[PDB]
Amino acid sequence: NRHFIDADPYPWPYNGALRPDNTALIIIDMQTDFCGKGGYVDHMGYDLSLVQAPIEPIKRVLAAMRAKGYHIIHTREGHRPDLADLPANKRWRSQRIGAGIGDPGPCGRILTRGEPGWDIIPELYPIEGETIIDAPGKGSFCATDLELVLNQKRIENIILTGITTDVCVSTTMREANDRGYECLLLEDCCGATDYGNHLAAIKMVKMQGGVFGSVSNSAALVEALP
Amino acid sequence: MVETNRHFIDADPYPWPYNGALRPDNTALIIIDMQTDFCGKGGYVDHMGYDLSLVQAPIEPIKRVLAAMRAKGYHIIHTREGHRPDLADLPANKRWRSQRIGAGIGDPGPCGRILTRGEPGWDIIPELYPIEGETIIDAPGKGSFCATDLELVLNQKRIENIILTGITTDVCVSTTMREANDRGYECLLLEDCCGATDYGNHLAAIKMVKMQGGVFGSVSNSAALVEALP
Amino acid sequence: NRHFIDADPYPWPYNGALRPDNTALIIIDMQTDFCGKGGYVDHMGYDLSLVQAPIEPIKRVLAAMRAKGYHIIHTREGHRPDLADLPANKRWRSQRIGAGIGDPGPCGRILTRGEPGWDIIPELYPIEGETIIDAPGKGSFCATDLELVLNQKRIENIILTGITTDVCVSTTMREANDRGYECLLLEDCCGATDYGNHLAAIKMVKMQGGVFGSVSNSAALVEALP
Amino acid sequence: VETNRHFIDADPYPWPYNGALRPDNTALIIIDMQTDFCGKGGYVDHMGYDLSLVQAPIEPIKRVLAAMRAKGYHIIHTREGHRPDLADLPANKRWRSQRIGAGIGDPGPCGRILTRGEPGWDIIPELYPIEGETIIDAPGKGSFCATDLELVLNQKRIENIILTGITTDVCVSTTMREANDRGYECLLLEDCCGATDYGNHLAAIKMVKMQGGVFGSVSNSAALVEALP
Ligand SMILES: *C(=O)N[C@H](CC(=O)O)C(=O)O
Ligand SMILES: *C(=O)N[C@H](CC(=O)O)C(=O)O
Ligand SMILES: [Cl-]
Secondary structure, eight states, X not given: OOOOBOOBSSOBSTTOOOOGGGEEEEEEOOBHHHHSTTSHHHHTTOOHHHHHTTHHHHHHHHHHHHHTTOEEEEEEEOBOTTOXXXXXXXXXXXXXXXXXXXXXXXTEETTBTTSGGGSBXXXXXXXXXXXXXXXXXXXXXXXXXXXXXXXXHXXXXXXXXXXXXXXXXXXXXXXXXXXXXXXXXXXXXXXXXXXXXXXXXXXXXXXXXXXXXXXXXXXXXXXXOO | OOOOSOOOBOOBSSOBSTTXXXXXXXXXEEEEOOBHHHHSTTSHHHHTTOOHHHHHTTHHHHHHHHHHHHHTTOEEEEEEEOBOTTOTTXXXXXXXXXXXXXXXXXXXXXXXXXXXXXXXGGSBOGGGOOOTTOEEEEESSSSTTTTSSHHHHHHHHTOOEEEEEEEOIIXXXXXXXXXXXXXXXXXXXXXXEEEOSSHHHHHHHHHHHHHHHHTTOEEEOHHXXXXXXX | OOOOBOOBSSOBSTTOOOOGGGEEEEEEOOBHHHHSTTSHHHHTTOOTHHHHTTHHHHHHHHHHHHHTTOEEEEEEEOBOTTOTTXXXXXXXXXXXXXXXXXXXXXXXXXXBTTSTTTSBOGGGOOOTTOEEEEESSSSTTTTSXXXXXXXXXXXXXXXXXXXXXXXXXXXXXXXXXXXXXXXXXXXXXXXXXXXXXHHHHHHHHHHHHHTTOEEEOHHHHHHHOO | OOOSOOOBOOBXXXXXXXXXXXXXXXXXXXXXXXXXXXXXXXXXXXXTOOHHHHHTTHHHHHHHHHHHHHTTOEEEEEEEOBOTTOXXXXXXXXXXXXXXXXXXXXXXXXXXXXXXXXXXXXXXXXXXXXXXXXXXXXXXXXXXXXXXHHHHHHHXXXXXXXXXXXXXXXXXXXXXXXXXXXXXXXXXXXXXXXXXXXXXXXXXXXXXXXXXXXXXXXXXXXXXXXHOO
8 A cells, every 4th residue: 555756766755655644744934034025035135036936836735735634834944032042153143144133124023933024925824734833943853843743743754845955954854864754855846045055955865875865846746646 | 462362263154163262161073973884995885885085085184183172172072873783773764775775774794784883884983083081972863963962961061162074074964063053053164074975965065054154154174273273 | 259049958059150141030830720710720629729829939039030130931831722732642631631631611722822821820921031931741841942042041050930849840840950950949939739749849859969959948049149 | 342452450540541552562661770779889878768668669670571571562771870971960960969978970889870881880680681672871860861762762663651660759750751741651650669768759659640640640560460461
């Protein structure tokens, strides 16, 4: 009763135990300030097109997985409004490049929970019953209840999407993989500030027989999802 | 002369550590996974067919940094990737992948059971071997924090700054750097003191650190570190 | 420049390093359903006076520590409204005793975040800049950002207050102590609905030369606080 | 009529809650049965406490251990202790131990107190591990803190934990609380634990039972061995 998705370097999940009850989609950090028109990344002159590219592929995967009753998880990078969870080095770096965490930005206080720019874009917005993780780090496990939630949901397989490929998505994939989760990265459903770094982060997954999991794409996933 | 207790290492994209609070008592070198298994002739990496020269290149630069930091009384930490001999800490997917490529964790190899604690090939290479008082972390994951006492030890030592070296750049070194950075540690990657299975991935992992004003920390090299280390 | 509070079994903190910048008060779980008139605990016929007794002593300690600029932290036990963070055993036990988590109670859904009964009582309500931890467990560290926050605040010493002495306060003290925090339990600022269990939890702290820290009272704290 | 649900008579509810009791999903944990905690010349003896209270659980544990080994249950052991360079030793923990005359790392009759690799730190011969039984080396009172215990339980797919060992109110209770918060279903065997003060042992057990079994449920060696599938 095994089911696989075509993937590189191996068909995923490794053991073919692919079911709605044991598999989650995670959509990482698809937040207005990071990928929306008029947010701080846009206003700062970064190559926003590369982080907007995955929106439509993610929307298709999200719709397909919702329709088949898979677990859906979302994450948002951000800080408590009093900045109690903000490391000093993280703050200092953000100030130095002109996007100081907690400082006023075009869509509210930058990377601050409760602010408009911090929230998930409307095109990928969560619905009731979809867990949202609020993460103070780049990895979604650090200082959150993500692992507790995955354990109570009995999730074994995670399909990763979102931004950026080399920062938050890679970090979360690496954390999950170390703990024994079986992870699939959808290459057309992620993007980064630097396309080369996006491509390299993907390549890194595949080495050593799939050191962090396996890699596929939205079409292959939607076509073969049970 | 005007003297300061703030000290920096020339680094990219910013002089490191960010606040200049660089002292023996608050700074550690970490040497990641310099094991016969990752960089010597008969280990898991060798078994997978990779070019050992890429992962041996950092040995001499690491040794120079290690000697300098030992001499000035900095904290020194070492890590080893590996599993309990009964494999109780080995995820099924990790095991399966290693078997599929012909380097099964726990399977017999030329230097003992692959990636298995207590086996000859699993140990740190003699030229970078720990000495007394240097904490060794035994990690079942690619990130040295997961399921270990690394964080507990860093906290009791009051370490604020970490200088990262070892292998591989894109797997264990990058993962550990990311974990440390998320928790607030201030991290410096020494680019000539790491290496990978694929040189492009090594270079990209280094570039990833520098983006967004040093998203994971900053990057320097052994010569610049040794020259400016207080 | 050492300062100590009279305490049993040793004057606290052990090294006398007692300052506003390195010391936090934590007020654990002073929530309406647990200690308020008409909450679920009151309706079940527990002796609410035992969990109300700490309110006035806590108020005194809180006022003194606020005035001197110490760190103040609050905790609330509770679950996400979709119950994604709720272990099945925890749920089952709560149902069996007629106080099912997420079920309708006299002050809203029991132990559910955002419900009236779940919030902190008005007499001990947080003010801006006082971090609130929302905990799905009895120990306030599990699956939260408490440790991350303590680390960024450079907190070394923790003064524990709140309820219940033997469940959430003891668990949090044990977690903190294992990580190296230096903890003071204020015996008149905690309570449990079984007074014997309260007394025993306190005794447990003191054994082996203060195995979990030391124990004092609100008057001794306020008198000697620097 | 047969069922694959199985329960152990326990207080306040029959355990495990859902009757899903199998060798593959259930572990015994034996906490800190070390010469340091229950032997002459160890840490606990140095602090003046009565060793009979912490030796009492030895024979009941031995019986449970034998029964669970014979039926192929997972067996886990823990040892409280520190790296020999004391890198994992909080300063307050050390200071307290010195103040009462049982300093961690200090020389004792059975080697350096609470120090990994020393004779006094090892598990007593009567309850010694065998191959395939995971041993956790814990720098804290709770066996989860800074260890791989949770990773191991997750890879073994363990759902149910039966707790034994010493002391009831310190290491056993702490580990039970940690496990319970994460969703593990825990049974404390009251005759298979003991403490420095019998009243504190009894109270730690009572604390488990309140609020419908806030930390799990409680039974005894005879009831467990009689009903273990
Ligand atoms: C996680 O990766 N979050 C942000 C988004 C950005 O466009 O800067 C990041 O990249 O680190
Ligand atoms: C932490 O102790 N929370 C509650 C309060 C109650 O009165 O029932 C608990 O005891 O579990
Ligand atoms: Cl200075």
